[PDB]
Amino acid sequence: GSNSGEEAEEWLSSLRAHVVRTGIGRARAELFEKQIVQHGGQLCPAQGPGVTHIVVDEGMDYERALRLLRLPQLPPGAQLVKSAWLSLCLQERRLVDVAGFSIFIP
Numbered sequence: 001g002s003n004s005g006e007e008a009e010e011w012l013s014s015l016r017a018h019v020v021r022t023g024i025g026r027a028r029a030e031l032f033e034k035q036i037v038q039h040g041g042q043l044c045p046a047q048g049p050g051v052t053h054i055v056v057d058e059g060m061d062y063e064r065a066l067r068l069l070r071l072p073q074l075p076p077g078a079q080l081v082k083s084a085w086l087s088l089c090l091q092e093r094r095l096v097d098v099a100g101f102s103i104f105i106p
Contacts, residue, residue: 010040011093017043017086018051020069023060029083035090046070053098054080062103080104 019033032055033043044051046069060068062080074080084101088094 012041
């Protein structure tokens with residue numbers, strides 16, 4: 001059985017998203033991961049071969065997101081964004097400035 005049909009042009013695939021199931025897993029927000037993958041954007045936990053983005057329910061802080069997602073430290077550049085950032089990434093089908101909805105600390 002072939003696994004091809006919905007090209008989706010795989011635009012989001014240009015980036016690697018990551019949703020915290022332990023954090024989000026609210027009910028609707030969770031769909032976040034589904035929307036990402038459904039767009040060709042694969043996601044995964046600390047195992048994420050190239051997870052530079054970290055989406056959270058905004059609840060947990062960045063410093064916490066580290067252990068929350070099972071990661072003692074993010075790779076180079078890798079930044080932690082909030083749910084708002086992801087939403088746009090889906091609607092604006094692009095890479096919006098994280099600083100807009102990034103914790104970092106402030």
